Structure 1
Amino acid sequence: EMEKEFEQIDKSGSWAAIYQDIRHEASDFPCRVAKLPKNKNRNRYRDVSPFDHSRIKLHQEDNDYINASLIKMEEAQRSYILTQGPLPNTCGHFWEMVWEQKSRGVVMLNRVMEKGSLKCAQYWPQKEEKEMIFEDTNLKLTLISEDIKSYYTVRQLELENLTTQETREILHFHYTTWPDFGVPESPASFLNFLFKVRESGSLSPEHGPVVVHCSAGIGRSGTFCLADTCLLLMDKRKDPSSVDIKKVLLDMRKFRMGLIQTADQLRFSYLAVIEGAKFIMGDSSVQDQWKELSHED
């Protein structure tokens, strides 16, 4: 049981050992397409690639490659697409994926610039009056509105297939205070954000998988999905004791490498899930409490 295991690990200060064990047991599948010479400029990080078996394929005869993985959690019955922060030359590909996969929401866990470097291209319009057109994939993107909070922003975007003139509303959930290789300020601020994404309906099975990304698409992105999947599993069975966090993380890693980067991000996952369990099991006060502690106002 997670809570007992958590204290058992904290007591013996063995998170590093526990975390390394996961790395040692993680699935190792080929990433041949990602390593093809022609795709070199489509990858942000040389050592972070999507496995061939679970990679998202763009629907274009030219090059169907994009650094993005479909994490399909069979038992939990929820899917996510984890991808790297789009590059100046892959923003059109990024949105093409969102369209073809019928995604309703996009979760961004990083900032365009962090530690003085560009960890993600400016792939969405910052001003209503200046919409964006991706000529290579023939898509139009317009900012419709945005709700700015203290540590996160929610934007309503309109994505249009210039080819068919069809349009869709895309919700953009932007967590702006989660440091690279770091953890959220507190379980409360993280859960407050997750529940926001959840309440939008973006994770519903009626929609395509939500797109989740940070810079590499595995650290913060992995932490986010692991916590959400664990809470979902627990929610399906209304039994917090039935969830094996490490086991779920390993199953997730069968679809994309390196999910969760530091021992602390893993430790934070336990923290978020344990606290989230309160809501799952009937506590209708914790949500408001998280909102308070988050200081989003």
Structure 2
Amino acid sequence: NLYFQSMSRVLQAEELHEKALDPFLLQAEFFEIPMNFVDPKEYDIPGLVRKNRYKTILPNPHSRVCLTSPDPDDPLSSYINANYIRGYGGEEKVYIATQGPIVSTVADFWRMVWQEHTPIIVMITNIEEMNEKCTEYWPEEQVAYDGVEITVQKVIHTEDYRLRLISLKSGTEERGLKHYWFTSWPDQKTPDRAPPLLHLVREVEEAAQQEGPHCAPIIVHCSAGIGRTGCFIATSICCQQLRQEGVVDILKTTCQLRQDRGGMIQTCEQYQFVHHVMSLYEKQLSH
């Protein structure tokens, strides 16, 4: 309740099932959630226009990811359109929500990856949306940006994603990175389109567990880094909530998301989709 009054609607199984199929209650609830967008005039940085895909979708200042290398005192060099996102139970920095890199922000995105020790990237962009919704920021094989050698070591093709196993080398230190490019994001967010997003959420949460204690932030991106990104993150949080608590609170999870980054879960169709995803998971867990 720091940036706005949070809301909550704790759903047990039966109500969750019905709620996902009630678009009139969904839209009534959704359009009461504050967007918590940033006034664009909050950022008065010469050259900032080149860093943002959309002039009105800006990172909230309190949770903004600051690029501290090579100059933390230069407002432009330290800027990236990204925010630290709290996970389940308010765990700090479980994710980073960011826009899909553009030509002028490819090297900045890798600076963020390196600064944050990011082990996993979740890219929610369809094949046909390249390169207008996301610039291809990974190399075909190898590339070096600001002293970091980025190498794509393997491309694992699945039905709903392309997984790239990447190496990051600077000086003597070498780190691994998992890049999950999800290619099945639906235009029509019907229940039959919920299984590929659920599989991705479950794959990524098992991969984040395999990193061991205090997993570094997981980077999630789509075009503006709010809509599809908000859905992925809300689904991931509620999946942990349902297993731990036996209930889901998409409403309170959406409020938690909007407090960290304005516009997280941009549309009502996305809001309803998260309910289709959680209702399905609940049925699957029941067995």
- TM value normalised by structure 2: 0.84
* 200 and 33 in structure 1: CA distance in 2 versus 1, 3 angstrom threshold: same
| Counterpart in the other structure of 1:147 | 156
| Counterpart in the other structure of 2:267 | 262
| Counterpart in the other structure of 1:277 | 282
Match for 1:40: what amino acid? V
CA contact (8 A) 1:113 1:119 kept: no
User: Between the two proteins, what is the percent identity of the paired residues?
Assistant: 30
Match for 1:18: what amino acid? E
Q: Deviations over 1:185-223 (max 9, x none)?
A: 622111111111122236755321100001110000100
Match for 2:100: what amino acid? G
Q: Compute the displacement of 1:74 (Å).
A: 6.5
| Counterpart in the other structure of 1:18 | 29
Return the match for 1:250 from 237, 250, 255: 255
**What's the RMSD between the two structures over aligned residues?**
2.6
Instruction: Provide the rounded CA distance (Å) in 1 between the counterparts of 2:190 and 2:138.
Output: 25
Q: Compute the displacement of 1:236 (Å).
A: 2.9
CA contact (8 A) 1:218 1:261 kept: yes
* 159 and 190 in structure 1: CA distance in 2 versus 1, 3 angstrom threshold: same
Instruction: Provide the rounded CA distance (Å) in 2 between the counterparts of 1:15 and 1:35.
Output: 37
Report the 3-state secondary structure (helix = DSSP H, G, I; strand = E; otherwise coil) of the residue aligned with 1:146.
strand
CA contact (8 A) 1:45 1:216 kept: yes
* 172 and 9 in structure 1: CA distance in 2 versus 1, 3 angstrom threshold: closer
| Counterpart in the other structure of 1:227 | 235
Return the match for 1:170 from 155, 167, 177: 177
Match for 2:30: what amino acid? Y
Q: Which runs of 5+ in 1 are unaligned?
A: 284-297
Report the 3-state secondary structure (helix = DSSP H, G, I; strand = E; otherwise coil) of the residue aligned with 1:121.
coil
Return the match for 1:42 from 51, 61, 64: 51
Report the 3-state secondary structure (helix = DSSP H, G, I; strand = E; otherwise coil) of the residue aligned with 2:65.
strand
For residues 210-221 of structure 1, what are the structure 2 equivalents within 5 Å? 210-221=218-229
Q: Compute the displacement of 1:27 (Å).
A: 3.5
Match for 2:147: what amino acid? N
Q: Does 1:72 align with 2:86?
A: yes
Instruction: Provide the rounded CA distance (Å) in 2 between the counterparts of 1:181 and 1:118.
Output: 21
Instruction: Provide the rounded CA distance (Å) in 2 between the counterparts of 1:226 and 1:113.
Output: 25
Q: Does 1:201 align with 2:214?
A: no
* 125 and 277 in structure 1: CA distance in 2 versus 1, 3 angstrom threshold: same
For residues 57-68 of structure 1, what are the structure 2 equivalents within 5 Å? 57-60=66-69, 61=71, 62=74, 63-68=77-82
Instruction: Provide the rounded CA distance (Å) in 1 between the counterparts of 2:41 and 2:111.
Output: 22
Q: Deviations over 1:81-131 (max 9, x none)?
A: 0000111121111111111111100000004652x86111111123xxx31
Q: Does 1:159 align with 2:168?
A: yes
Q: Compute the displacement of 1:16 (Å).
A: 2.7
CA contact (8 A) 1:71 1:81 kept: yes
Instruction: Provide the rounded CA distance (Å) in 1 between the counterparts of 2:159 and 2:206.
Output: 19
Return the match for 1:189 from 190, 196, 202: 196
| Counterpart in the other structure of 1:295 | none
CA contact (8 A) 2:63 2:261 kept: yes
Q: Does 1:110 align with 2:125?
A: yes
Q: Compute the displacement of 1:230 (Å).
A: 1.1
Q: Deviations over 1:219-268 (max 9, x none)?
A: 0010000011111123233x22xx32111111111010101122111111
